[PDB]
């Protein structure tokens, strides 16, 4: 396995049934033209180790957990397959909720992901929005009502909105839990549960974490299906 040479090099450990081979370069991912336009402008030389192994897993439709240090490039690891997903699901109709739901523990990390996502949404003509607590409800409710394919959210504000019927998850087929361990450290487990229970069963779900403790591992087993576990580090 040329694979095992590459994984071993990049300190990639994979666990679970039938993980696809890692993609050795950007071109092999076969992301659509508009996304490539935006990737070329970032002057990356190469895929990061989790993009390498993570992308093909995500693009295959499989559930997974990606464990890597802050800075290993996981945002793109779930975002970019999200775009492909959206391209393969029907067109967004008046009043449809989001197709892709990215949950994040804090306002700041929610906004970071919106920032990364902005350029690709614009190149791909997708609409997205950052939902977070503390800030004016008005603009956020506007965005959700005009319709977004992508909704990046912190749990509390999302709940409030669902309960008020200002959006809904009956189209959410691609679920992301960024910074899951932090999300659990800050005590959001009941809230994340209350959220997912409203998500139709055929969802692909992807968790991302810098660490792999008991609490997170248990969340994975309750929420994921036959998941792949990717580790990055010695
Ligand atoms: N393929 C790549 N090559 C080089 N840098 C990248 C690549 N993908 C992402 N980056 C950059 O690496 C940094 C870390 O990305 P990020 O998604 O924040 O990682 P994490 O979420 O693991 O902390 C960002 O500044 C991002 O622009």
Residue numbers in the entry: 71 to 304
Task: Give excerpts from the publication.
DExD/H-box RNA helicases, from virus and bacteria to eukaryotes, play important roles in processes including ribosome biogenesis, RNA processing and folding, ribonucleoprotein (RNP) remodeling, RNA nuclear export, the regulation of RNA translation and transcription, and nonsense-mediated RNA decay. DExD/H-box proteins often contain accessory regulatory domains and localization modules, but their cores consist of two RecA-like domains joined by a short flexible linker. The N-terminal domain is commonly referred to as conserved domain-1, or DEAD-domain, and the C-terminal domain as conserved domain-2, or helicase domain. Both domains contribute to the binding site for RNA substrates and both contribute to ATP hydrolysis. We used X-ray crystallography to determine the structures of the DEAD-domains of DDX2A, DDX2B, DDX5, DDX10, DDX18, DDX20, DDX47, DDX52, and DDX53, as well as the helicase domains of DDX25 and DDX41.
